[PDB]
Paper text:
As a sirtuin (SIR2) family protein, defense-associated sirtuin2 (DSR2) has been demonstrated to participate in bacterial anti-phage resistance via depleting nicotinamide adenine dinucleotide (NAD+) of infected cells, which can be activated by tail tube protein (TTP) and inhibited by DSR anti-defense 1 (DSAD1) of diverse phages.
The binding pocket on CTD of DSR2B/closed widens to accommodate TTP with only a small switch of its helix α42. Notably, this interaction drags the loop of DSR2A/open toward TTP with a distance of 8 Å. This dragged position is almost the one of DSR2B/closed, implying a transition state of DSR2A conformational change triggered by TTP from an open state to a closed state. The combination of TTP acts like a key, allosterically causing the MID and SIR2 domain of both protomers to undergo profound conformational changes with complicated translocation of its secondary structure elements, though the conformational changes that happened on DSR2B and DSR2A are quite different.
Author numbering:
A (entry chain C): 1 to 73, 189 to 263
B (entry chain B), C (entry chain A): 336 to 1005
Write the structure that this text describes.
Amino acid sequence: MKTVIQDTADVYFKRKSDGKLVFTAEAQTASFSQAISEEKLRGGIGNKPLYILKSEKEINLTVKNAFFDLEWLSDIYIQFPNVSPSGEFEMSLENGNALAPEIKFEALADTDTDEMAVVIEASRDENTAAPVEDTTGSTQSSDLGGTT
Amino acid sequence: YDYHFEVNGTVVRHKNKGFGYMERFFELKESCDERSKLSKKQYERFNALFNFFEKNGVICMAKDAGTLNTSIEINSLAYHGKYDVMKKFIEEQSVSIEDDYKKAFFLACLGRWEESYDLYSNIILNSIDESNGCVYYLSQINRYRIYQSITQAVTQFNGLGLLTFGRHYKPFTDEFLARIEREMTNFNIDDLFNGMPFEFQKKYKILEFLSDNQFLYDDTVKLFELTNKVRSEMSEGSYSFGMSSDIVVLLRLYDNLRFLYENCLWSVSFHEFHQYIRNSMSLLIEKAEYERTRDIDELGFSFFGKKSGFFMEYYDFVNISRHFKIDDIKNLERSCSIDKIRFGEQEKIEEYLVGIAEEITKQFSANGMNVVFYTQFISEAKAALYFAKYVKLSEEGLGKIVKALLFYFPERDLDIGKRYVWLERLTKCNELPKSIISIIDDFLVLQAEKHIDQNYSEVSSNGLYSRDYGALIKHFEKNFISKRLSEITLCLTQDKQKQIDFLFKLLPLLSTNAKSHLLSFKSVENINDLMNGIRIGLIDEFTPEHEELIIEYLETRKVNYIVEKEKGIQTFSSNDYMSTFGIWYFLEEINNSKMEEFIGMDDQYDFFVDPENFDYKKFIPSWLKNYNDKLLGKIAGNKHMKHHVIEVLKERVKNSNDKRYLEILMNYFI
Amino acid sequence: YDYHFEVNGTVVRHKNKGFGYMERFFELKESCDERSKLSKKQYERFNALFNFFEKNGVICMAKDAGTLNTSIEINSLAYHGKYDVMKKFIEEQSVSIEDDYKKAFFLACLGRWEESYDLYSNIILNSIDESNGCVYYLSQINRYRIYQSITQAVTQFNGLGLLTFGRHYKPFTDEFLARIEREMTNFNIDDLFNGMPFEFQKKYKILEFLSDNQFLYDDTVKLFELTNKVRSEMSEGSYSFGMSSDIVVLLRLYDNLRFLYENCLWSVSFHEFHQYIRNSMSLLIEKAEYERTRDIDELGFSFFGKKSGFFMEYYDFVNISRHFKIDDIKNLERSCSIDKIRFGEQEKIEEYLVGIAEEITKQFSANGMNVVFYTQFISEAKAALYFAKYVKLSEEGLGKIVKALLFYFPERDLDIGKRYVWLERLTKCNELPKSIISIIDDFLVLQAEKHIDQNYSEVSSNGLYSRDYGALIKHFEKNFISKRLSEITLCLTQDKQKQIDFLFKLLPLLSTNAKSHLLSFKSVENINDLMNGIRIGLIDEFTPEHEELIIEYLETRKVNYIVEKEKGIQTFSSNDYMSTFGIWYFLEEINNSKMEEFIGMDDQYDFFVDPENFDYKKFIPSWLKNYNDKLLGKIAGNKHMKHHVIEVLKERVKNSNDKRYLEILMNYFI
């Protein structure tokens, strides 16, 4: 068959503003341990009956060896409302006569919690887990390479 | 090594070739006359050894002894999370250096890691005079542990703390970060015990494990060595009574916790102690759903007793709530069955959950929390409310926990569709009274009050939105009117746009007069409103202009398909748009003949709409995960769909590890 | 800890402050022009470092991260099973003290644990005039480990299985078991690294872990990454990328086996190291079975087009053959299907299995066994021949394995009930060729010649006898009649007892004179002499004279049924062959109309002579276990019971735990 040997990639944390979508800076990260996990359970809506059972989709991700994460290149007091933005993702693949499937994630929050380790420095390689958010629009897209 | 002392206090000997002193010692405890042979000076030393072996639970005599009700009781304000009482302890005037030792551990649990480095340094600078150096040594460990927490929180705050907070959050002064780096330079934590005096190293060889950075390895290998006994317990494995297995795994956890929290050791807040609690409690639950559904016979009863269910109590709830993340509980809820595990001490759990509620109300309803305390606390507060599906709560207790889940939890840790999940979970044994309904009703009005701005969108991670709060009230009270969402419904004009779309999705909550003022202001004009007006009960049959919009929508979705596959941009839906249309055509809810002209863009469409010409190799058997009782009835009923699924479903039972396929293969298709 | 050396062959900067000395070195590898500008003494030192990091598999830094697919080679005669070259290395009189160190390892692998202890004792006396002191440390370790191996064996040759197995007493004399113990008191194993100089404690610090009884605790704890891979399977949608935690487990197994064998360390014989290999290999077969049956993926196709998959090779075979029991392989064969993992390198696996034959042959054809070597070789030999279901063999090699198994294997552990299983399993990949018939055909002559004594019988742990061998000849060679077994048959005396019925248990292998003359001894007497005819005789003919005795047997049972009905307790007979008689009526061998008029017997009789009018409320569900595949195939034609045996499986599949009932319905009834 076609020489599909592609395993690892390089993922691009893009940039959006607090109420805007600026994309100008970037905060991209290297290889992804990549527990990409689609626990989709999204459901059809019936016409006559209704149900409140568990029916929804979700996409979790994680990455490894983050870089480019300082200033995007003191009131120590946390508040309950947040207007933090959501950096869009790109994942650039390789290893084919076609170009990368170029999987884009449109709106993405950042869900990692901190953790203190006995040894030193909390990990040999850090991780940022990242869920995928939606309000009235698409959650992912695959830009198959085709030529080149 | 002259006596094995076990987790129950039982005493068996090894390498004691001589006189049996600890074999003999409890005979002085038994007969009051034999201990009367002691001198009136050494009787005072038996007045002290009796106390120490009682309260440390080695009152169990030897192997020549019966059963023991091995209780556990942890007298520490930090374990139970008594945050106000810990604050009132620090502000008191210090008397003892063993009170400064306990203040130093409370100011770290409360987040004050600078004040806690300082009081550890003060003890070390004036507790070398004392004739026993356990306070010197244990503070010299804790300070390096409090160093490491500061040192890699400033690494977090400058890195991944940037893009998760929206601020910078440096809580330590740059003069503070430089002082602690030049004091703690060339400190070797592995070499501290050899730095101690000679008399200390013979009287305290049991504190040498606290300065090796890998100290529960002697317990983690035993946890593994008792895991593969469960992995080798498939062909009617024994030792499921647990008097030599479960109690061993559990009483070695309760002795480690009571060592680390009574002796105020800061090594308890790290990931390596957090993982030991995760591995031990997940192993007791894995031997509670597996090794519950075993071959139940009379031959296994005569082999061994104690085949009752597992029992969780107050201390087991705190240990899962503190030491697990949400995903680590989410493994267990899909692995094991926690509804099969009974919870005891329901009224002590409702004083741990309510103190978690009031550490979130009385610390976010003010101007804010401490960020270093937020990092420690908020994982515990999330998992405690998540795992409160399993306890029953009072009406005054449920009201305070819900008002902190819905109002004062920060939005960055719990978005609108994860607050909904943890609200639906608190009903499964605590069905909503009228006093809790008026809290959800008061949260729907704060979401109304935020769509006054035009550019605002409820972000959700699972796509459950503010509608589901509405459908949750109506599920418990079928005749309900929000008499305050009506008063904003009957004050609507056309300038507000996002208001109208929000309150329309909460339409059954509105009163019958107040509906029509918004029914007159919103016409169905897009496939979103076609589906939003289905999920509120507005539409019961498609007036065929409704059937036109689906035809209108796919015509757009047809023509982009050619000019996207030449580009290769292969789209992925956000929601079950196209798949629901085929259910509308397979259940004959749409009778349009133009529906067949769109066969070939989506395989879930192509199953329902062309139920023969599909060739079935594109069937994804996770599609039966999300079908109702109704639809699977007609899947059996379709003369073509009845049997290809049976070959698909059988190999999803022969090969997979989910029980839902086993339910589908009998209940609908037999 | 200035650099973090990963297992894949990469380097990460870890705590290097100043000049990165490992960055420049790999540059000096890649740039040959830069390699030139050195001195003429630090150039010969570079050839030493280049040959080090290329045999230890440290390729490069991680910053460029070259695509690596490195393999494993274990340069050791002891790993591969070369027992003959080890022996002609012991006889070759050594020249060097790091060559006596290799023999005392090779003696220990051969079970010469007395000459191992002494030769390690010469190396301890003779390593005074040596600079490094490495052979001093690794010989104290190995002699202590060879001391621990003796002190166990004194508790097994005199302990559990001591009875009559040949050399039933000890192999170590009283003068030696006292000489070792008086030398080994107060050898603190923990005080061995500390006693060595501070030059040994810095130039050779990496051998600190071998001086601990608790060694490989630091690798059992890190194998808790098994939880990280139960977590990805339980989360059920987790698509780990790159060097996943599977490949870390495999590359860390390989890096432990290659260390301990090539450094000639005796801890590789202990149970701690075997359980590490079991738990790590079992996990990798589990992640292979999970991946080959993952539920596709709707969206992950952007990366999940295919996966190459865990496949077996030669070193993965020797590790399952050496380190598992038959009880452990059967746990993997219950959970996984190893006939779907491809087994590579099948010219090296044949040479490892031919060697195990040539060690069984050269030890139990001669009377020179070593009772320590037999204790530890026999588990590997049993596991390697059991796990060769999956490797294709050449007809020379399949001969030397089957010959060594049937004739030359010791009877004390692998009886004929298990010799049948482990020759049945070799027929899976290899259809039974012409030569292996002759190797069995020699054996059934020899099994005849041991049945002339009246007091001999074939003990079977399963119950399978030599009767089942003979089917397997006829199962493949449909036209084969053993000539010498016919030659045995023409020389019989009717006064024989064991020889007679034995040939009846191989009667379908005989010639038309040998069948007839043995039929001359075949004389049926009654019903008790008839129902064992399908068990033993196998005439395969139902004459009406035999069918008249069946009607006469139920008629005399009906006369006894009048007494059983008048007494009030109509219990069935002890020789309840009425339950069997309905099956022969169901499979159309008896065509009498009086079979349906014989009601009042056991309900299995009425179940098959009248499947319509049977009380399915009076059906007993446990009957389905005892029903063969011809019946369970033939019930599906009987539609007058098809709709109700599905009603009693479904009344148990959710309800019981016996998965045979599921396998009845999911293989047949659906």
